[PDB]
Structure formats: structure tokens, C-alpha cells
Design a protein around this ligand. Structure first.
Ligand SMILES: Nc1nc2c(ncn2[C@@H]2O[C@H](COP(=O)(O)OP(=O)(O)OP(=O)(O)O)[C@@H](O)[C@H]2O)c(=O)[nH]1
Ligand SMILES: Nc1nc2c(ncn2[C@@H]2O[C@H](COP(=O)(O)OP(=O)(O)O)[C@@H](O)[C@H]2O)c(=O)[nH]1
Ligand SMILES: CC(C)(C)c1[nH]cnc1/C=c1\[nH]c(=O)/c(=C/c2ccccc2)[nH]c1=O
Ligand SMILES: [Mg+2]
Lengths: 437, 425, 155
């Protein structure tokens, strides 16, 4: 048992974190006050769920989680929500004045006022660990805190925890549910400064999640609540292997081994099925073949892109529920013949498979029907570079006119950082092009 | 950040400022004695943005009242909510400014400004996390224009890290006491270009045209004009007083509205335009973008939108709002610059204003605002070429080159707007 | 030299002082350094009775300063309607052009003096007169969106 610390930065990271830990508690049988009747070792243990929860002498199971924001509105809701007693109160950390959708404020001027406290509080959690393996960092690309403070924190964590893995869950901007015109800037700036410091990053395209809510869950105008419960379902499917017994992705290092062939191309595409409206409680159950085929349908992807015009470097299937291994193998065999799924010539072409036989969990207030079996496919495809191309294009349109740049230069950033970041993104798009061959 | 500090300067500034406090006090359930007798808990959730809480559940506007003329402070105090303001926050002289920017900026105004700053400092010191400042004033007089811009410069120096927004009333011969108003406004605009983050251009030319031509008021009064102004100011501050779910202070809104620091002069609009049935969402959207609804006398179809914000208030289909906002950008895509992607943003507040179930407030950052500045510049130049009444300003120490400088800065601003109106991606 | 004193009395609206200086030989057509006469100054500052007095005692209604401004230009610019009427009655050139190519009609239009625009038109103001940028008064009213003025300028 080696511990993992989850860090949630900015509004998006905090609100998604709240949804994730609610679901985690449900999956492990933990109550909102931290009690876990099924855990018969009171005040301690080394079970798989202890990677994410510590224990107090009173039987309280406490998330290994830190929440950070530069204004208090969102974290104040955690302090008073259903799970107000779950977290370490000192691991909920807020400033007074936010980054105003300005990367430079989050990274330089405002972020610098709280970074040392955040690191000292993370150190307190790390000191609790017998064998810390690393960090899971949740944040938006588009916010000034999610972009700028996350980059600052990742830089500092690399210095203070040199051998620890750092994984990201990053919210990629969609104008349908955003009011930040400068998000393309913040997105490129944080990607440039974080690339060296992140070992694996799962982008979540808000437009993809929006589409799924509208099309599969029949929600006309998705709220952040709708988006976050779906995102939390997918995050849980990705982190389950760290929290339960299993054979695939059993620690943070293995995520990199399985999904990241070399360090800069570290952005796997997640695809999740099935997503069924809770109104359809009596849906006929889908087969292993059906949910597996669904993983290669663009409609179920977490990021909008077309893997049919890219190359695969890695493919892992993480099943949950009533899934017989022989049926997975036959479905995979069918996938290769029916579909055109092209791998690069230097990687093994086999699909790695994990099965967690516990039925998937849904939150009662959620929009999802219970299902007997579900699957999250994690692939590293060059097609995800289309997501970078879209961001880089919006960046270029605005930067050609230097629109909004004065806000950043007035908050501790040199103007040269814009072109430095954009050149790094150009090199990243070239990295994908060269791997695509 | 939460608190805003409000300053109102001069006759116009205090008149529209008083109406602002009447209107938002009613919206928040605050009576003229500062007592809260509202009905909804949402009325108090963000009350601290504009009100200090005193003893006995008493709310006091965070407002400073300034004038070189004593009479104006008397008229505000006798107004409906006159007794609601902090008596020590009245800072007035006795001489007046005589519609002379120079007197407001260099003479009588300079002698009074430090007293105003002392009150500002006292209000700022008691804020948990000050967002910044809002100032109401006219540009055509002497106190609001000359002393108002002096106050802005002094505040910018002392609070460089705080947002400074103005509601600035632009002069028009249609509502005019004197031909020196173009002087006073031109001298003021250079100050606003350098020292404010956002300026709402409240154009008396547009206000008059709305009342006379749209509302059919044969003889518009200041009260008629100010009815439009208070509706606009209520709508522009709604996102800070009833934030609902948006998480945005003044700075975050300025970041997303102002792509170039000097080009921060906004065209406000409001629907429905009324004088003292409910519209549909399509009607709200159509009227908001209509030139006749603009509170600045500029034709938006003569320029391009850099950014647009729109605040809908009332019970309405969020989806329908999205469809209508989409339709406007699609049918008229050429009037929104293509090099600022997704540059039109909207919010919906469930709580409607007084007397209306459906309303919308428009905030346009359009290059067409150059038409307003060209109008003032042409009048300024007509007067300045004949050197008319310059000795009223040179007599207060001003130099003729200061007029030349103001003319040049004005036309540089116009040139800057034209540059981005013709730009392409 | 009573010329400078008459210029100042005319500018300041010192009616009794204007009468005294003229009675003692003051030059009614004195000029300051820029060529402005007492009549220019009285017309600029709105002193109607002084405008009348000067015209009754030999003032040149169409005198120009160094920039080509006539008294009518200045009354039309500042907006003194009664003075505009008096100047026209005493033979002011309704279409005098200054060094910027402006006529009185241009200046009344720019400054929004709508009653003065109507009077000038009635006295034969040239709707086709172009300033140095090619603009007639009507062009100014269309360019600046002054629908009330544009309507007046069409007759
Ligand atoms: N899926 C999801 N996206 C969110 C949420 N909150 C914000 N987003 C998006 O994140 C971006 C805005 O960044 P925020 O996270 O709100 O900003 P922040 O990190 O708090 O930084 P500042 O407020 O600028 O200091 C937009 O793209 C939002 O659509 C959320 O709860 N869930
Ligand atoms: N819309 C509006 N304009 C006003 C008001 N009062 C004065 N003005 C306008 O403001 C200008 C005169 O400035 P004023 O505020 O009276 O002078 P100050 O006291 O020296 O600041 C003119 O353009 C007037 O038309 C008012 O109550 N409402
Ligand atoms: C998303 C939305 C519509 C809220 C938005 N996006 C960018 N701007 C705004 C609105 C405003 N933007 C502003 O800058 C604004 C300024 C203000 C607010 C209160 C008092 C004085 C000025 N008031 C607003 O309502
Ligand atoms: Mg935030």
C-alpha cells in the first residue's frame, strides 16, 4: 500500500474533487462523517482503499486530499456541504482575491501569496504517508487559478518531491459553458509550464461532457453539477485501480508505463461506456461486446477528436462489473477485425485489460442509470493533437493582435512568455505529427 | 473580493448617483432608514458589495458624495433616500466650479480633494477585500469633469491594484447649458483613457433621442434621462449584487471585456426602453442590439464589436437565450471581430428589476464608439480654432498646449478604434 | 489709445463704458493682435445691446480677423440667436468663409444651434458650401447622426 494525494486547484478542480470524493465514499462504503462500518481494523490498516484514505483512532476515514483556491466561494461550499466533516479542515485552503481569469495572477502575483502555505500543508499530508507515490492534480485550463497556480504548484512539487509521480485531470475549455474569453491563453500558458512536470494528464473536454449530457442523459442545458457527476464517474473508473485490488494500473508509475511511450506525448484519451439516463431504469443490459465497441465511437470520448485519422501507441480497457474475461478477449478480437485501429510500428499491439468485478456505483442524486457492466478505455492516440490544434488556433487569432496581453504583462509575466509557450505547443503538435508517420 | 466604494461628483454625478442608490436599495429591500424589510434571502446575500452593515441591522451605502457646489448636497439629502447616506461622507465646498474644468481640476477642486481622499481612505480601510471603485459624474461640467478626473488620478496613485470604473455622462447640445462642454469633456476623456479600467459612456445625445423619438416625450427632463440611466446602472451592477452562480469580481469582468487598455469605453443598452406586456427573449435580444436602444449615440453597424456582455433578468428559457444570442452572431458575424473567438457572453439573473418581468442590459465594447468621440472632437476643434473662452481656462493656470495635447489624445483614441475596426485575421 | 479699452469693454459687456469711449473718439473698428474688433468680441460673448450700439456707430459688420472669422461666424458658433438676427439685419455676409472653409452655417450645425441654422438658411445660407475637407453642413449632420439637424437642413 502506497499513498496517493489528490490536489484540487481552482473552482473547476474543487467542484470536480467534491464530486469525486462523494463517489469514492459510496464505492468504499464510507459515510459523510468518515465512518466505515465494513472496515473492521479500527484506526488503521493497509487495505487498497488506504491509498486514498487515512484513518483516525475514532474510525474516521479521511481523504488524502487538498483543496486550494484563490477566493473562498467554492471551498466555503465544501466546508458546509454534506461532506463538511470528511476532509482535514486545514487541507481546505483559500485566499481572498482570485486570479481574475489571468494565468499571470495565478502563477506570479496572487498565487505567490499562498504557495508556501499550500506546500507546508501538503507536506503535512506527505509526512503521514509510509510510501507516498505521488499526486493527482485536478484543475481547469481556462481559469487563472486552475492554469497559473497549478503551474506554480507543479513546479514547486517537482523540486520538493523529485521522485514522485504527478498525474493531471485537466478541464479543457468549451465556450458553451464558459464566460472566459482569454481561456485559450491560459490553456497554452499552463500546458507549456506544466509539460515537464506532469507524467500523465487526462484532459476532459467540457464540450464532450456537455454533448454526452445532452445526447445520452437528455439534459437540455447541463449545469456544472451535471457535468461534474459524469466527469466524476469517469475519474473514478480511471483511479479505481489505485484504490482496489487489481492487475492493471496498480500504481501511478504503471500509468506512465502503460500509457505514455515518451514523456511529452503524455495525454491519453479516455472513452467511457455506457452512459444511460437514470430515467431508463429498465434498459436492457448491454453485452461486453457492445460496451467495448462503444469505446471506439467518437460520441463516448472525453475529448472531441477523431482517432480514426490518428495512430495508437497504447490501449488499456478498465472494466467494472459482471464481465467474464473470455468475453472481453472475444470482443477485442472482433474490434481488431471490424474496425480500422492502426498502431504505430514500435509498440506492442495488444490491449491491456483490467476487470473490477464490483458493479459500478452511481450517486443517487445523479443522472445515470445503474448498469451491470461498464468500461473505460484509455488510449494514447495521436488524434488528440486535434484538441491542441483547436486551442492553438484561437490563441493565434488573439495573439496576432496582442488582444488582452496587457493584463498578463501587468501581473508579473514577460510578454516573451506568450511566444515561448506557443513555440512549445508548436513543437508538441510536431511531436504528434512525427509519431503519426 | 467583495466591497465596492462608490463616489459621486458634481451635480450630474450626485443626481444619477442618488437615483442609483434609490433603485438598488429597492431591489435589495432597504428602506430610506437603512432598515432591511425585504422578502427574499437573496436580497441580502451580496448586500455587503455596496452597503456597510451598521448596528441594529442597518445598512449604509458605501458612498462618498462630492461637490464644489453646496446646494447639490442639500438636494440629495432631501431626496427620498437622502438620510440614508453617512453624513460624514458629504464632502462639499462653497464656491462652485462654474462649468470650468480648470477650476474643478486645479483650483477649487484641488483644495478639496484631500478631504475627499480622507473619506475614501476611511471607507477603504474597513473593507474585507476591496474590489475597486465606481464613480458617477458628467464630463461636460466643471466639478464632475475636472475634479472627478483629479479624484480618479489620486485614487489610481493610492490604490493602483484596485479596479476603477466610471459612469460618465457625455454632453450634447440637445441637453446643454453652454458651449464650453466640449472643452470640459475633451480634457476629461484623456484622463479616463489613462486612469480608468472601464467607462460606461452615458451619452446625453442618445438619452435625449430615446426620450424624444422613441418614448414620444415632447420635452424630456433630466428625470426622464435619468430614468434610463438608473435602469442601465442597475443592470450593469446586477452581476455583482445578485451573482447567482457566476463567480466574477470587477477585475475578472474587465479582463474579459477589455482587450486593449485604452479601448475601455463601453456602449450601454437596455431593453425594454420605458418612460415613467412583458417582452419575449427574441424581442429582448433584438432590442438590445438595435442602435435605437443604445445609451451612446453611435451606430454599432458602423463599427465592429470587440467584446459584448449581456445580462438578462427575469424568468426565461436559458436555452432560448442561447439560441437568440447565437442567431445575432450568425446573421451579423461580420460585425463581431473574428480574432477574438467567442467574444459575446451572457448571464441570466432570475430576479427582475422594478416594474418589469423581463429585461436585458447590453454592454458593448464596439469600435463604433469612435463616433461619439469624433462628435465631441469636432465641437472641441470648432471652439478651439476660434480660441473661444480660452481665458476662462488659462486664467486658472492652464496652458494652451494643454488644449492642444487634449485634442491630440482625443484623435489618437479615434485612430486606435479605426485601426481595430479594419483589422482582419 | 482708447482702442484697447473699447475692445475690453465690448468683451466684458460694459455697456456704459462702451458709450463713454465712443463719445471720446475711441476707434469702433479697433483691432486686437489677432484682428478681432469690438463687434467680434461683443458678438462672441453675447452682449446684444453692445452689438446694436457698435453697428449704430460705424462698426464693420463683415470685418474679418486674421483667421477669416466674421462677427456672424462667432455668433453662430457660440449660439447667440438675437445677435445672429441683428448682424444679418445690418448686412452680415451669411456665406462668409473663414480660413478653415467654414461658413456660419457650418459652425451652427457643428454646435447644434438648430434655431440659428434655420435663420441662416432663411437668409440664404449656402447648403452646397464645402469646408476644407469637402463637407457641407448637411454632410456634417449625416456624418454625426444628427437627424434633427439633417431634417432642418433639407427645405
Ligand atoms: N466541468 C466543469 N468545468 C468548470 C467548472 N468550473 C469552471 N469550469 C470551467 O473552468 C474554466 C473557468 O475556470 P475556473 O476553474 O472557474 O477558474 P479558477 O481556477 O477558479 O481561476 P480564477 O477564478 O480565474 O481565479 C471554464 O472553462 C469553466 O467552464 C466545474 O465545476 N465543472
Ligand atoms: N443625464 C443627466 N445629465 C446631467 C444632469 N445634470 C447635469 N447634467 C449634464 O452634465 C453636464 C453639466 O455638468 P454638471 O454635473 O451639471 O456640472 P458640475 O456640477 O460642475 O459637475 C451637462 O452635459 C448636463 O446636460 C442629470 O441629472 N442627468
Ligand atoms: C458573463 C457576464 C455577462 C457576466 C460578463 N462577462 C464579461 N462582462 C460581463 C458583465 C459585466 N461586465 C463588467 O465589466 C461590469 C462592470 C461593472 C459592474 C458593477 C459596477 C460597475 C461596473 N458589469 C457587468 O455586468
Ligand atoms: Mg475562481
Amino acid at each position: 500500500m502506497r499513498e496517493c494525494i489528490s490536489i484540487h486547484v481552482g473552482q473547476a478542480g474543487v467542484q470536480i474533487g467534491n464530486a469525486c470524493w462523494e463517489l469514492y465514499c459510496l464505492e468504499h462504503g464510507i459515510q459523510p462523517d468518515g465512518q466505515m462500518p465494513s472496515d473492521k481494523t479500527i484506526g488503521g490498516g493497509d487495505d487498497s482503499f488506504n491509498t486514498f484514505f487515512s484513518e483516525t483512532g475514532a474510525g474516521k476515514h479521511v481523504p488524502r486530499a487538498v483543496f486550494v483556491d484563490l477566493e473562498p466561494t467554492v471551498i466555503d461550499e465544501v466546508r458546509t456541504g454534506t461532506y463538511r466533516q470528511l476532509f482535514h479542515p486545514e487541507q481546505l485552503i483559500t485566499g481572498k482575491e482570485d486570479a481574475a481569469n489571468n494565468y499571470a495572477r495565478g502563477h506570479y502575483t496572487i498565487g505567490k501569496e499562498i504557495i508556501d502555505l499550500v506546500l507546508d500543508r501538503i507536506r503535512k499530508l506527505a509526512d503521514q504517508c509510509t510510501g507516498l507515490q505521488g499526486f493527482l492534480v485536478f484543475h481547469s485550463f481556462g481559469g487563472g487559478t486552475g492554469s497559473g497556480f497549478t503551474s506554480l504548484l507543479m513546479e514547486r512539487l517537482s523540486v520538493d518531491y523529485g521522485k514522485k509521480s504527478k498525474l493531471e485531470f485537466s478541464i479543457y475549455p468549451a465556450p458553451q459553458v464558459s464566460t472566459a474569453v482569454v481561456e485559450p491563453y491560459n490553456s497554452i500558458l499552463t500546458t507549456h509550464t506544466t509539460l515537464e512536470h506532469s507524467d500523465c494528464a487526462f484532459m476532459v473536454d467540457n464540450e464532450a461532457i456537455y454533448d454526452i449530457c445532452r445526447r445520452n442523459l437528455d439534459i437540455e442545458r447541463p449545469t456544472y453539477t451535471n457535468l461534474n457527476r459524469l466527469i466524476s464517474q469517469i475519474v473514478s473508473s480511471i483511479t479505481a485501480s489505485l484504490r482496489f485490488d487489481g492487475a492493471l494500473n496498480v500504481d501511478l508509475t504503471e500509468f506512465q508505463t502503460n500509457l505514455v511511450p515518451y514523456p511529452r506525448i503524455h495525454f491519453p484519451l479516455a472513452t467511457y461506456a455506457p452512459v444511460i439516463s437514470a430515467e431508463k431504469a429498465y434498459h436492457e443490459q448491454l453485452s461486453v461486446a457492445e460496451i467495448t465497441n462503444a469505446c471506439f465511437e467518437p460520441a463516448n470520448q472525453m475529448v472531441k477528436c477523431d482517432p480514426r485519422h490518428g495512430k495508437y501507441m497504447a490501449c488499456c480497457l478498465l472494466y467494472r462489473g459482471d464481465v467474464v474475461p473470455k468475453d472481453v478477449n472475444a470482443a477485442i478480437a472482433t474490434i481488431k477485425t471490424k474496425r480500422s485501429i492502426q498502431f504505430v510500428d514500435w509498440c506492442p499491439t495488444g490491449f491491456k485489460v483490467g476487470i473490477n468485478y464490483q458493479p459500478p456505483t452511481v450517486v443517487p442524486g445523479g443522472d445515470l442509470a445503474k448498469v451491470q457492466r461498464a468500461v473505460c478505455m484509455l488510449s494514447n492516440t495521436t488524434a488528440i493533437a486535434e484538441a491542441w490544434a483547436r486551442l492553438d488556433h484561437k490563441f493565434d487569432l488573439m495573439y496576432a493582435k496582442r488582444a488582452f496581453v496587457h493584463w498578463y504583462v501587468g501581473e508579473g509575466m514577460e510578454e516573451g512568455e506568450f511566444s515561448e509557450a506557443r513555440e512549445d505547443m508548436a513543437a508538441l503538435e510536431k511531436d504528434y505529427e512525427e509519431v503519426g508517420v | 473580493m467583495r466591497e465596492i466604494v462608490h463616489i459621486q461628483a458634481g451635480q450630474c454625478g450626485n443626481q444619477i448617483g442618488a437615483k442609483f442608490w434609490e433603485v438598488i436599495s429597492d431591489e435589495h429591500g432597504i428602506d430610506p432608514t437603512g432598515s432591511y424589510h425585504g422578502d427574499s434571502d437573496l436580497q441580502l446575500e451580496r448586500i455587503n458589495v455596496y452597503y456597510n452593515e451598521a448596528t441594529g441591522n442597518k445598512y449604509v451605502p458605501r458612498a462618498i458624495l462630492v461637490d464644489l457646489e453646496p446646494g447639490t448636497m442639500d438636494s440629495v439629502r432631501s431626496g427620498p433616500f437622502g438620510q440614508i447616506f453617512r453624513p460624514d461622507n458629504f464632502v462639499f465646498g462653497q464656491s462652485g466650479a462654474g462649468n470650468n474644468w480648470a477650476k474643478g481640476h486645479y483650483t477649487e477642486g484641488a483644495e478639496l480633494v484631500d478631504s475627499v481622499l480622507d473619506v475614501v481612505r476611511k471607507e477603504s480601510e474597513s473593507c474585507d477585500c476591496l474590489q475597486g471603485f465606481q464613480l458617477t459624474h458628467s464630463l461636460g461640467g466643471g466639478t464632475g469633469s475636472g475634479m472627478g478626473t483629479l479624484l480618479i488620478s489620486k485614487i489610481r496613485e493610492e490604490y493602483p491594484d484596485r479596479i476603477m470604473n466610471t459612469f460618465s455622462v457625455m454632453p450634447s447640445p440637445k441637453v446643454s447649458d453652454t458651449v464650453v462642454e466640449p472643452y470640459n469633456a475633451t480634457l476629461s476623456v484623456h484622463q479616463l483613457v489613462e486612469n480608468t479600467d472601464e467607462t460606461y459612456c452615458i451619452d446625453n445625445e442618445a438619452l435625449y433621442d430615446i426620450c424624444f423619438r422613441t418614448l414620444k416625450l415632447t420635452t424630456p427632463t433630466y428625470g426622464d434621462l435619468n430614468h434610463l440611466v438608473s435602469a442601465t446602472m442597475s443592470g450593469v451592477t446586477t452581476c455583482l449584487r445578485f451573482p447567482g452562480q457566476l463567480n466574477a469580481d470587477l477585475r475578472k469582468l474587465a479582463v474579459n471585456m477589455v482587450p486593449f487598455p485604452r479601448l475601455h469605453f463601453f456602449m450601454p443598452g437596455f431593453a425594454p426602453l420605458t418612460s415613467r406586456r412583458a417582452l419575449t427573449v427574441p424581442e429582448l435580444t433584438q432590442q438590445m442590439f438595435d442602435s435605437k436602444n443604445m445609451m451612446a449615440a453611435c451606430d454599432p453597424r458602423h463599427g465592429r464589436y470587440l467584446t459584448v456582455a449581456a445580462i438578462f433578468r427575469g424568468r426565461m428559457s436559458m436555452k432560448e437565450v442561447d439560441e437568440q444570442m447565437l442567431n445575432v452572431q450568425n446573421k451579423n458575424s461580420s460585425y463581431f471581430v473574428e480574432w477574438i473567438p467567442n467574444n459575446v457572453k451572457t448571464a441570466v439573473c432570475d430576479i427582475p428589476p422594478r416594474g418589469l418581468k423581463m429585461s436585458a442590459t447590453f454592454i458593448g465594447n464596439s469600435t463604433a464608439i469612435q463616433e461619439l468621440f469624433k462628435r465631441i472632437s469636432e465641437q472641441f476643434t470648432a471652439m478651439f480654432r476660434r480660441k473661444a473662452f480660452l481665458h476662462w481656462y488659462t486664467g486658472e493656470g492652464m496652458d494652451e498646449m494643454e488644449f492642444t495635447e487634449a485634442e491630440s489624445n482625443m484623435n489618437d483614441l479615434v485612430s486606435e478604434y479605426q485601426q481595430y475596426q479594419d483589422a482582419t485575421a | 489709445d482708447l482702442g484697447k479699452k473699447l475692445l475690453e469693454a465690448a468683451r466684458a459687456g460694459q455697456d456704459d463704458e462702451v458709450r463713454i469711449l465712443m463719445a471720446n473718439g475711441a476707434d469702433v473698428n479697433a483691432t486686437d493682435a489677432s484682428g478681432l474688433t469690438p463687434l467680434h468680441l461683443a458678438a462672441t460673448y453675447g452682449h446684444l445691446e453692445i452689438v446694436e450700439v457698435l453697428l449704430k456707430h460705424g462698426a464693420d459688420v463683415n470685418a474679418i480677423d486674421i483667421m477669416g472669422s466674421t462677427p456672424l461666424h462667432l455668433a453662430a458658433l457660440i449660439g447667440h440667436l438675437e445677435i445672429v438676427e441683428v448682424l444679418l439685419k445690418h448686412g452680415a455676409d451669411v456665406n462668409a468663409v473663414d480660413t478653415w472653409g467654414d461658413t456660419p452655417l457650418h459652425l451652427a450645425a457643428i454646435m447644434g444651434h438648430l434655431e440659428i441654422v434655420e435663420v441662416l438658411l432663411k437668409h440664404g445660407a449656402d447648403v452646397n458650401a464645402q469646408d476644407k475637407f469637402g463637407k457641407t453642413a448637411f454632410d456634417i449632420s449625416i456624418d454625426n447622426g444628427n437627424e434633427d439637424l439633417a431634417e432642418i437642413l433639407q427645405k
